[PDB]
């Protein structure tokens, strides 16, 4: 059933007549499938308002969540430090999943170990696991620091990370001076971003809490930048580039951009770049600390304000036009460096692109989802473009964040038909895009299944997905993109307007039917 | 048991049970019982191909979870599980059964999923299968396979023991343990159907609960993955007297040998049809070999799987080991090897392609091997100025 | 009829039943249209091999050319110099078209003037037009230099640019010292790229020919870069960035990146940036001159080798992996600067992306078109990716260029099924993609019509367009992209692989039909 | 008339003839006779909407050219033109006519396109229209309009003078000089059809050669663009005695007035149908006004065009303009939106009741967009 000259993979191989007949025989004979008319009825029902009411009355069932668990964020945070091995105290399956998830998004090796807690540890605890794991990890992978997080098993059993690490040090499993920062990252609290926050706070505390006597605020003439959970390499790069352009001394704490973007030159590099231990130890001497994603860096903020005594500025994520302007102005104020002509020109070029594309962007309706800071930044930028967000979904959002986003929407005439949903999953969003159809979705790869569903209702009901966020599995190298700053705004704007124009081209490609509007010039 | 702190890739019991055995079943809803992580990371992560209307009568690529919070850990999740089952019934009325795959906390907080499963199954007249596949159990996915097979045996397999309404034929076989990666099972099934047999049951890949229930009615059990389904296969041999055998459809040689071995378990008509099928496909796989063996002959792969590589003229050779043995394809940590400049492909098309099994899959396998091994990207690792 | 809450534009307004009925009445009553069956038959015939044979026998008729006329390239070249007003001696219609074409591609203001030669000038020549035009242009727009090209009218009537400009200077219309370089740019010879070459050679000659006595090769320790006709701002930017990163002194010549990318800050900037007159005058003192697009810089190369005595290196366009390596190695050799670690890492990252995406890229069949250097670079990169280019079309290419491309194809196993076409238009290409269907087209916006045609034959016969080249009218801000160097190779690779993946997602989006292959992970 | 060496977007005679008058005629093939530039820059440049199968029975968005080389300039292009016409016949058999639009060199090298057109037309029994539209003629597209109209009159308009087979009705009108920008003519035509009239001819926008040939059979000539088609209208008024009048469908007020004026030239049944159409469309444009006038009332547009603006509460001036209506990128850089009454760049229709909604939405979108309020950096 294959021609050697034109070999077909699963698609469209299984569309061949013999495969079709075989599948029909299987279904009719043994699958006891519901009749196609019944399936059609149920699908149509799932697209209705009544189904939406039933869906939104869910309190125990979650379908297609838009969030992950804390240790994933802890691993991502740990990977941003120099020669640091992420270490998850708990069961091995968790680490396998974390590594696979990050490999699929970044298409890079991702280093993480587990101490393989099994049923033996379920009763006696995981102290022996911690000792052996720390010893083996240090001996094998030679990290400069081991950052310890936890899986849900360790948290439920109640493993005392501090005591276990101290006992490992006391009994000679690891050197006493070897840095082993830790954080409790319970998967049943918050989400992956919470794990990032907890891990970062643990590392900062480890390196700074007991040596605050000799620290003077602003003595190193630098600004600390805490990116938070970030899966776009361009975001790290653009923040560094913008701060270098202004001549502002900075320390990007948890920089994983080098380790997640190693070159292919015939050598495997376990470690690359990252925030050095010296930078963390000297961090309290900075002028101030800026949190790029404040809505999931609350614990970090508490630590930095309470211990380092940094007057952390009240900044939104530097996304879109106004918030990037505010970020640059605040950096200017803190550092005393004027905003250079290059950044002013880049801003003007972003405004130029907005002016060029506003006719296509204006009034477009979007359903979006993702993490709180990312989502609110995207909403703000969409409002700046004259677009109308309708369905704003943040599964791991909270009431305070929702209040903030509602305030943002109320300030704009383009936020009138917008509602914010927290604690809702992608099945809720599927219902929403069926009942109140937007023009497009903005979200991660899981939204593709929603688009598929919408297309099944009809071509006129299809809601195309625009892939911005985490994770993106079905496209290549989008992790290299930027979403922050003027450059990120330009990239997002280009993606949006060209998605609109691409969709219009598809809808107007029909010869002698719709091609009267198949304009060469758009 | 894995050495603590050594960066292995082994999964857990939940991955073995939910990801491998229960998850591919299409007309059942599988609840990742516990915190959100496991279901999210495992969602649509395995290419266990199926035919259905996702979200209506099929649910494979969806992630159903109880999404445990702190309250659920402290006070237990049995009430939440019952409410979740009710909500599943309301919102997905065409589901033909529910499995409850336990994550780690389920086994540590003293939740009794068996009682909830029994009560709700009796109430709703539905098969609810409690699987105690908590990730910390055992040392690998293998115990997860064992637990999932035991759940199959205890809750689904014996459902039609007293039922005699299924019309049986002497040529009834069940495909056990084929997960239909990239349609591999379909590529296998078409051959068996062309041989005169009818595949009454095929699970878990593109599997339905009814097919599992019909499995004890077949004459032969053709097992693909012995490791993951040997428990259930031996159980059905012991209880129902159904013989079972392993089949290997990887490459023309293994496919032909397996087809002849399977046909040898039936009458003369099946053997004649087997010869006809072999004769029919001979020119296709011969053309594939003629095209691709010159491009792949002599290339060395490191470490069932052997057949196709030899059919393409490749030699299976099985840190400084890689530099010493100098393999062309690792063929056995994908991105690490890729960074070292060595391709890594398995015998199943796990990542993006396939099928690889059967005569149709051999063409795809050969094309992919040639594509990856002979790609110029592997020859550009050294900068010309370095 | 319109509903005020969902106002429909032309599409889909005209799909309403009343409009359909009106159009049907118009067609049936008054248009004397051929029957639909006849139209279908003729279309199907146009999609055949016999039609292709008749199409390729064309000798007098050109349909849908893939090239423009010389003065467009002359204008683009002139715009790359500091405070320079492009001036086209001839008819005003030409300048209107040139400005519109560039406005639509770049979405920016484009400065160009005409001296409005009319029937009187058609009789008596355009000397008075030249005098008045030069005077008015200088007085009104205050340029530092006026670069003069010609429309076909001036070329046919044989206006002597040199004599006219000298007479304008002699008779006091412009100051004698005011720079007025000129070039004859006949629209009936070559193409727009030829116009670019002619204009650049004219400006270089004007600024350097008579002052070569004191010039010493390599006395300024710089390399001249001549980009040629370039419509991607990213290409100028990336060449400058790579040279600066390498610590190589360079002078980009005809740099129009600033003028084509002015910020929107409430003021109109007629001029911005550009190659200064001092840079042009000092160009003979450079170590060497590198031509980025040698296949349309023949006249410039002759002048630079013959007059400046620069040993212009034999470099291909720095596109893809191998040719970027060769370009960087040659620059290193000329300047004595080692290739820095940053460029090596960028190369390794490109190779990494190639390795990650090769499974999707390998064996894909492409029809492509555009300018000679761009096309050959794209072909080389496609061969490096394991893709097979099948239909290589260059309307403004020549036999020598074709020989070069054939040699490149013969060096690669992925060039086995490739044919190079010169002097063929997009109607030829339409026939080719019907008869020997590729997987994708790579070209400018005019290919969208070909895609439309292919879709009319059937969805299985549709050839999607990937928009790389000039001009791009139906998408926004693609002119900001990069095609040169490692960065351009990364951008192109990402575009290609994601186009493939988007198409696959489209063809596997059918519920219960093809969605079995609608994989989350690709 | 135009000062040499000044910037202007003013077009040539070829743009006025090929781009405006001849090019929108869907079922004819228009050859840009000369070098490659003009046809390429003009290809699909104007949004003159049509219905057809492009490349089979319709050819609007295609660029047909002789692609003159140096040998064509030196030795003339008449033989090339004849061979080109043969090739066009072979490859596009469903074309219903050919126009030859002269570019600049055609007028200067002494090519005789008229003789070639006559010979090939007689040989192939096809209408071949030679247009002497060379860009250097005149000072603007206006002479191009005139030349194109003269070509229409001389070669196409009189083709059915001796034919009497067309069944005529007293309500026969031709829409002349509507180029169907974004479907503007269609949005006009439906209203005329709803009023009871029969639009026998509509050109150039979505125009066919048969409609041009049928134009002398109508009772009234409704001219949208008087500047470009007054020549042909006057010719038809003299030769055929067909009255012509201008109609303005820009905004509800102008549309209503024009519909009433047109209906007044027919019997009472047409006037009654006109009143019915106005009544039918009143709530729609009233709703459009109710939605968009509060967003646009008091805004100043600097300058057919005026009607929709006053219908939306806008103020027209001839400044401190919110909008410029009479080169767009210069004003955009200066921070002022630029928009013509026709929706040339990307939108439409704007004419008629259906077009009024689109026009109002576009005005609100452009004037109230936040992009115009972000020109000043907060630190400057
Ligand atoms: S079940 Fe097993 S690790 Fe036998 S857990 Fe694993 S789909 Fe492997 S070598 Mo992934 S014992 Fe299957 C397997 Fe083999 S998931 Fe697949 S490829 S044939
Ligand atoms: S023909 Fe004329 S410049 Fe009357 S040459 Fe020009 S499609 Fe203008 S103001 Mo382009 S006299 Fe038409 C015109 Fe008006 S091309 Fe269009 S918009 S109504
Ligand atoms: S070994 Fe296996 S995958 Fe691990 S938890 Fe246990 S069943 Fe599950 Fe789950 S939410 Fe995240 S990923 Fe874990 S820390 Fe818990
Ligand atoms: S005023 Fe008008 S557009 Fe100008 S040439 Fe003359 S008819 Fe044509 Fe043509 S090829 Fe290029 S664009 Fe000219 S220089 Fe000649
Ligand atoms: Fe990678
Ligand atoms: Fe612009």
Say if CB C101 and CB C72 are below 8 A apart. Answer: yes
Q: Is the peptide bond before B194 cis (omega within 30 degrees of 0)?
A: no
Residue C205 DSSP SS3: helix
The CATH number for B257's domain is 3.40.50.1980
Q: Does residue B228's CB lie within 6 angstroms of at least one atom of ligand 1?
A: yes
Domain-located, residue A47:
no
**Residue A63 CB contacts under 8 Å (≥ 6 apart), including other chains:** A425, A426, A427, B62, B63, B64, B65, B91
Cα–Cα dist D120/D130, whole Å: 11
Does B163 lie in the same domain as B107?
A: no
C88 touches C116 (CB < 8 A)? no
Kindly list the catalytic residues of D. 12, 15, 46, 145
Contacts of C21 by beta carbon, 8 Å cutoff, 6+ apart: none
For residue A229, which of A78, A443, A403 has the smallest C-alpha distance? A78
Q: Which residues line ligand 4 (CB under 6 A)?
A: C 69, 71, 91, 93-94, 97, 151-152, 187; D 12, 14, 35-38, 41, 103-104, 134-135
Same domain? For B146 and B227 the reply is no
Largest CA distance in chain A: 82
- What Cα–Cα distance (Å) separates residue C160 from each residue in B336, D70, D279? 68, 18, 67
First to last CA, chain D: 44
Task: Give start and end residues of each alpha helix (H) in chain B.
Answer: 13-14, 37-42, 70-75, 78-91, 104-108, 113-124, 141-152, 184-194, 209-214, 226-240, 252-263, 268-296, 306-311, 320-325, 334-339, 358-373
**Closest C-alpha among C322, C319, C369 to residue C487:** C319
Between the alpha carbon of residue A317 and those of residues A140, A226, A256, A350, A436, the distances in Å are 39, 11, 19, 17, 29
Looking at the domain assignment, is residue A25 inside a domain?
no
Same domain, D244 and D165: yes
Which of D361, D372, D379 is facing A339, going by the closest CB pair? Answer: D379
Task: Tell me which chain A residues have a C-beta less than 8 angstroms from the C-beta of C490.
Answer: 477, 480
* Chains near D (3 or more Cβ pairs under 8 Å): A, C
Verify that C124 and C269 share a domain, yes or no: no
User: Do C205 and C102 share a domain, yes or no?
Assistant: yes
**Residue A53 domain-assigned?**
no
In a domain, A49, yes or no: no
- Nearest-angstrom CA–CA distance, C107 and C118: 30
Contact C111, D7 (CB under 8 A): yes
Residue whose C-alpha is closest to residue A421's, from A397, A388, A454 = A397
Q: What DSSP state is assigned to residue D48? A: B
Helix H segments across A30-160? 36-46, 49-56, 70-79, 92-106, 121-124, 127-141, 152-157
Pairing of strands B64-65, A62-63: antiparallel
What is the C-alpha to C-alpha distance for residues B298 and B78, in angstroms, rounded to an integer? Answer: 59
Q: Are residues D170 and D251 in the same domain?
A: yes
Q: How many CA atoms lie within 13 A of B327 on its CB side?
A: 22
Q: How far is CA A33 from the centre of its chain?
A: 39
DSSP code at position B352 = S
Number of residues that this document lists for chain B: 386
- Active-site residue, A463 included: no
Q: How far apart are CA C389 and CA C315, in angstroms?
A: 22
CATH code at position A494? 1.20.89.10
Long-range contacts for D237-242 (Cβ within 8 Å, ≥24 apart)?
A: D240/D216, D242/D216, D242/D218
The alpha helices in A304-425, defined as continuous H runs, are: 322-335, 341-361, 372-384, 399-410
Rounded to whole angstroms, the Cα distance separating D67 from C64 reads 11
CA distances from D173 to C486, D196, D206, D277 (A): 63, 11, 16, 18
C152 is catalytic: yes
Same domain, D188 and D132: no
Cβ(D184)–Cβ(D342) under 8 Å? yes
Q: Could you give the count of Cα atoms lying within 13 Å of C289 in the half-sphere of its Cβ?
A: 29
**Parallel/antiparallel/unpaired status of strands C388-394 and C419-422:** parallel
- Residue numbers after which chain C breaks, C to N beyond 2.5 angstroms: none
Please tell me the distance from the alpha carbon of residue C487 to that of residue C495, in angstroms, as a whole number. Answer: 12
Q: Cis peptide leading into B204, omega within 30 of 0?
A: yes
SS3 content of chain A, % helix, strand, coil (to 5): 50, 10, 35
Number of the ligand closest to the Cα of C117: 4
Q: What is the rounded distance in angstroms from the CA atom of residue B106 to the CA atom of residue B230?
A: 27
Q: Which residue on chain A is closest to B26 by alpha carbon?
A: A31
Cα distance between residue A257 and residue A275, in whole Å: 10
Cβ-defined contacts of C205-211 (< 8 Å, 24+):
C205/C181, C205/C303, C205/C307, C206/C179, C206/C180, C206/C181, C206/C182, C207/C179, C207/C181, C207/C277, C207/C280, C207/C281, C207/C283, C208/C280, C208/C281, C208/C283, C208/C284, C208/C307, C208/C308, C209/C307, C211/C281
**Residue D17 sits in the same domain as residue D151:** yes
Report residue D336 as tokens: 């002022």
d(CA C321, CA C318): 8
Q: Count Cβ neighbours within 10 Å for each residue of B82-119 and write b for 16 or more, e otherwise.
A: bbbbebbbebbebbbbbbbbbbbbbbbbebebeebbee
In sequence order, what DSSP letters do the residues of A186-241 get, joined into one string?
Answer: -TTSS-HHHHHHHHHHHHHHHHHGGG-TT--TTTT--EEEE--S---HHHHHHHHH
- Our CA dihedral for A233, A238, A240, A244, rounded to 10 degrees, sits at 160
Both D194 and D101 in one domain: the answer is no
C-beta pairs of D261-269 under 8 Å, 24+ apart in sequence: D262/D173, D262/D192, D262/D195, D262/D197, D262/D220, D262/D222, D263/D195, D265/D220, D266/D170, D266/D171, D266/D196, D266/D197, D267/D170, D269/D196
End-to-end CA, chain A: 45
- Tokens 């992996």 locate to C321
Nearest-angstrom CA–CA distance, C120 and A434: 67
List strands edge to edge, sheet with C288-291.
C250-252, C223-226, C288-291
Same domain? A412 vs A397: yes
What residue in A sits closest to B200 (Cα-Cα)? Answer: A30
Residues B125 and B250 in one domain: no
Q: Looking at the DSSP assignment, which residues form a beta bridge with residue C113?
A: C87
Residue C299 alpha carbon to ligand 4 centre in Å: 24
Give the list of residues 6+ apart from residue D302 with CB closer than 8 angstroms, or none: D316, D317, D318, D319, D321, D323, D324, D325, D326
> What residues make up the domain containing D248?
156-270
Identify whether C507 is part of a domain.
yes
In a shared domain, residues A261 and A277 = yes
CA–CA dist A356, D345 (Å, integer)? 12
Query: Hey, are the CB atoms on B351 and C354 less than 8 Å from each other?
Result: no
Q: How far apart are CA A480 and CA C311, in angstroms?
A: 39
We report the CATH number of the domain holding residue A402 as 3.40.50.1980
Pick the last residue of a domain from A319, A346, A376: A319
- The answer on D110 and D150 residing in a single domain is yes
Give the DSSP letter of residue C112.
Answer: -
H-helix or E-strand containing D32?
Answer: strand D29-33
Tell me, yes or no, whether C194 and C96 share the same domain.
Answer: yes
Report the half-sphere exposure of A263 (CA within 13 A, side-chain side).
Answer: 19
Q: Which of C120, C185, A277, C364 is nearest to B375 (CA)?
A: C364
In 3D space, the residue among D334, D119, A103, A219 whose CA is nearest the CA of residue C263 turns out to be D334
Assess if residue C21 is contained within a domain. no
Cβ atoms of A387 and A500 within 8 Å: the answer is no
The answer to whether the Cα torsion of C137, C141, C147, C153 is positive or negative is negative
- Residue C332 backbone phi and psi in degrees, to 5: -60, -45
A197 and A221 together in one domain: no
Query: Which residues does chain D have within 8 Å of residue C121's beta carbon, measured at their own beta carbons?
Result: 136
- At how many degrees (to 10) do helices C485-507 and C322-335 cross? 170
Measured from the Cβ of residue D345, the count of other Cβ atoms closer than 10 Å reads 17
Which of A214, A229, A250 is at the close of a domain?
A214
What are the structure tokens assigned to A515, written together?
Answer: 């091609």
Residues A146 and A188 in one domain: yes
* Structure tokens that stand for B364 in this block: 């795809």
**Domain identity same for A210 and A119:** yes
* In-domain check, residue A332: yes
Number of domains in chain A: 4
C294, C427: one domain: no
Q: Which domain holds residue A406?
A: 364-469
> Closest ligand to A262 CA?
5
Q: Give the tokens for residue B71.
A: 């309250």
Distance C471 CA to ligand 5 centre (A): 33
- For A233, counting Cβ atoms within 10 Å of its Cβ (0-12 exposed, 13-18 middle, 19+ buried), the class is buried
Name which of A360, A402, A412, A359 is nearest A381 in CA terms. A412
Token digits of residue B28: 């059942």
Q: Which of C319, C348, C372 is a domain's end point?
A: C319
Give the number of the atom of ligand 2 that is nearest the alpha carbon of residue D181: 7
Indicate if C225 and C310 belong to the same structural domain.
yes
Buried b (16+ CB within 10 A) or exposed e, D187-207: bbbbbbbbbbbbbbbbbbbbb
Radius of gyration over alpha carbons of chain B, in Å?
23
Residue B131 shares a structural domain with residue B262: no
Could you say which residues from 303 to 362 on chain A have a Cβ atom under 8 Å away from some Cβ of chain C? 344-349, 351-357, 360
Instruction: Give the E-state strand segments of C105-258 in sequence order.
Output: 113-114, 145-150, 223-226, 250-252
User: Tokens representing D368?
Assistant: 């109230």
| CB of B288 closer than 8 Å to CB of B363 | yes
The method of structure determination was cryo-EM
Tokens of B110: 């003293």
Q: Are both D108 and D172 inside the same structural domain?
A: no
Query: Is residue C376 assigned to a domain?
Result: yes
Interatomic CA distance for residues C104 and C109, integer angstroms: 10
Structure tokens given for D282: 């009143």
CB-based burial of residue D241 (10 Å sphere; 0-12 exposed, 13-18 middle, 19+ buried)?
Answer: exposed
Note if the bond before D98 is cis, omega within 30 degrees.
Answer: no
Cα C142 to Cα C136: distance, rounded to the nearest angstrom? 9
Is the distance from CB of A69 to CB of B105 less than 8 angstroms?
A: no
* A235 and A291 housed in the same domain: yes
Residue with tokens 């149709």: B360
Q: Is C34 helix (H, G, I), strand (E, B) or coil?
A: coil
Breaks (C-N over 2.5 A) in chain D follow: 303, 318, 326
Closest partner residue to C188 (CB to CB) among D73, D334, D375 is: D73
A137 marked among binding-site residues? no
Q: What is the dihedral of CA C34, C36, C41, C44, to 10 degrees?
A: 120
Look up tokens 């939306």; give the residue. D312
Q: With contact defined as beta carbons under 8 Å apart, do B242 and B182 qualify?
A: no
With beta carbons under 8 A apart, name residues in chain B contacting A62: 36, 63-67
DSSP for A411-422 reads: TSGGGTT-EEEE
Residue D199 to residue D184: CA distance in whole angstroms: 15
Residues D144 and D246 grouped into a single domain: no
Q: What string of DSSP letters covers B293-330?
A: HHHHTT-EE----HHHHHHTT-EE---HHHHHH--SB-
- Give the distance between the most distant pair of CA atoms in chain D: 76
**CA–CA distance, D199 with C153 (Å, rounded to integer):** 42
CB distance C515 to A452 below 8 Å: yes
Task: Give the gap in angstroms from C-alpha D71 to the nearest C-alpha of chain A.
Answer: 32
Ligand 1 site, residue B304, Cβ cutoff 6 A = no
> Closest residue (by CA) to atom 1 of ligand 2?
D228
Q: Which two tokens stand for residue B16?
A: 């073995």
Q: How far is CA B88 from CA A256, B81, B99, in A?
A: 41, 10, 11
| Cβ count within 10 A of residue B306 | 18
Phi and psi, residue A106, nearest 5°: -90, -20
Q: Was C152 annotated as part of a binding site?
A: yes
- Among B101, B104, B112, B82, CA closest to B18: B101
How many angstroms from the chain centroid is the CA of residue A454?
25
For residues A234 and A293, state if they share a domain: yes
């Amino acid at each position: 059933s294959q021609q050697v000259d034109k070999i077909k993979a699963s698609y469209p191989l299984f569309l061949d007549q013999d495969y079709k007949d075989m599948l029909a025989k299987k279904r009719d004979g043994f699958e006891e499938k519901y009749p196609q008319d019944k399936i059609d009825e149920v699908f149509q029902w799932t697209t209705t308002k009544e189904y939406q009411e039933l869906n939104f009355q869910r309190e125990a069932l979650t379908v297609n969540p838009a969030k992950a668990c804390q240790p994933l964020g802890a691993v991502l945070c740990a990977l941003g430090f120099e020669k640091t091995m992420p270490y998850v105290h708990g069961s091995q399956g968790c680490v396998a999943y974390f590594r696979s998830y990050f490999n699929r998004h970044f298409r890079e090796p991702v280093s993480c170990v587990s101490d393989s807690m099994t049923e033996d540890a379920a009763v006696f605890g995981g102290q022996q696991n911690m000792k052996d794991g720390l010893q083996n990890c240090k001996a094998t992978y030679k990290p400069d620091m081991i950052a310890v997080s936890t899986t849900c098993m360790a948290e439920v059993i109640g493993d005392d990370l501090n005591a276990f690490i101290n006992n490992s040090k006391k009994e000679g499993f690891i050197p006493d001076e070897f840095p082993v920062p830790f954080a409790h990252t319970p998967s049943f609290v918050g989400s992956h971003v919470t794990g990032w926050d907890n891990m970062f706070e643990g590392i900062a505390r480890y390196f700074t809490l007991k040596s605050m006597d000799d620290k003077v605020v602003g003595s190193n003439k630098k600004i600390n930048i805490v990116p938070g959970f970030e899966t776009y390499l361009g975001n790290f790069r653009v923040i560094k580039r913008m701060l270098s352009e202004m001549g502002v001394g900075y320390s990007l704490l948890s920089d994983p951009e080098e380790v997640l973007d190693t070159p292919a030159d015939g050598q495997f590099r376990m470690y690359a770049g990252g925030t050095t231990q010296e930078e963390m130890k000297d961090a309290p001497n900075a002028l101030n600390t800026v949190l790029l994603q404040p809505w999931h860096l609350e614990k970090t903020k508490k630590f930095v304000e309470g211990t380092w005594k940094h007057e952390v500025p009240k900044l939104n994520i530097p996304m879109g036009l106004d918030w990037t302007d505010e970020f640059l102005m605040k950096v200017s104020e803190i550092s005393g460096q004027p905003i250079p002509a290059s950044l002013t020109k880049e801003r003007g070029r972003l405004v130029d692109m907005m002016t060029d594309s506003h006719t296509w962007l204006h009034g477009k309706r979007f359903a979006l989802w993702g993490d709180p800071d990312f989502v609110m930044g995207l909403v703000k930028f969409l409002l700046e473009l004259g677009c109308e967000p309708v369905h704003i979904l943040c599964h791991n959002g909270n009431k305070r964040w929702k209040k903030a986003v509602d305030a943002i929407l109320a300030a704009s005439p383009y936020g009138k038909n917008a509602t914010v949903y927290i604690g809702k999953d992608l099945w809720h969003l599927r219902s929403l895009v069926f009942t109140d159809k937007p023009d497009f979705m903005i979200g991660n790869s899981y939204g593709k299944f929603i688009q598929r569903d919408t297309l099944h209702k009809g071509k006129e009901f299809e809601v195309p997905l625009i892939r911005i966020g985490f994770p993106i599995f079905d496209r290549h190298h989008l992790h290299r993109s930027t979403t922050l700053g003027y450059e990120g705004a330009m990239q997002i704007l280009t993606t949006l307007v060209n998605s609109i124009l691409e969709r219009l081209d598809e809808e107007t490609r029909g010869m002698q039917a719709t091609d009267y509007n198949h304009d060469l010039v758009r | 048991k894995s050495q603590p702190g050594l960066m292995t890739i082994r999964g857990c019991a939940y991955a073995g049970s939910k990801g491998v055995v229960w998850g591919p079943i299409k007309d059942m809803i599988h609840i990742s019982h516990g915190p959100v992580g496991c279901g999210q990371y495992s969602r649509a992560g395995r290419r266990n191909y199926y035919i259905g209307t996702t979200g209506v009568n099929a649910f494979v690529t969806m992630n159903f979870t109880s999404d445990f919070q702190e309250k659920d850990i402290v006070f237990g999740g049995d009430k939440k599980l019952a409410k979740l089952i009710d909500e599943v019934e309301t919102l997905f009325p065409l589901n033909k059964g529910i499995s409850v795959q336990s994550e780690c906390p389920i086994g540590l907080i003293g939740d009794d999923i068996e009682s909830v499963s029994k009560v709700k199954g009796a109430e709703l007249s539905k098969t609810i299968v409690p699987v105690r596949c908590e990730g910390f159990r055992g040392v690998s996915q293998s115990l997860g396979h064992h637990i999932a097979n035991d759940a199959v045996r205890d809750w689904v397999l014996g459902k039609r023991d007293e039922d005699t309404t299924f019309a049986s034929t002497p040529y009834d076989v069940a495909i056990i343990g084929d997960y239909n990666i990239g349609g591999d099972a379909w590529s296998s099934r078409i051959l068996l159907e062309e041989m005169g047999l009818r595949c009454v049951a095929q699970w878990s890949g593109d599997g339905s609960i009814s097919e599992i229930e019909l499995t004890p009615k077949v004459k032969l059990n053709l097992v693909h993955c012995y490791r993951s389904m040997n428990y259930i296969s031996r159980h059905m041999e012991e209880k129902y007297g159904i013989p079972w055998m392993e089949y290997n459809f990887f490459g023309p040689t293994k496919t032909i040998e397996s087809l002849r071995a399977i046909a040898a378990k039936f009458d003369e008509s099946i053997q004649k049809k087997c010869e006809e099928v072999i004769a029919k496909y001979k020119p296709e796989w011969e053309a594939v070999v003629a095209k691709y063996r010159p491009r792949l002959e002599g290339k060395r792969v490191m470490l069932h799987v052997i057949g196709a590589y030899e059919d393409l003229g490749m030699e299976v050779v099985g840190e400084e080991f890689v530099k010493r043995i100098k393999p062309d394809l690792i063929g056995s940590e994908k991105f690490i090897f890729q960074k070292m400049g060595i391709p890594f492909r398995e015998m199943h098309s796990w990542d993006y392609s396939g099928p690889y099994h059967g005569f149709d899959g051999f063409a795809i396998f050969a094309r992919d091997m040639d594509m990856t091994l002979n790609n110029p990207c592997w020859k550009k690792l050294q900068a010309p100025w370095e």
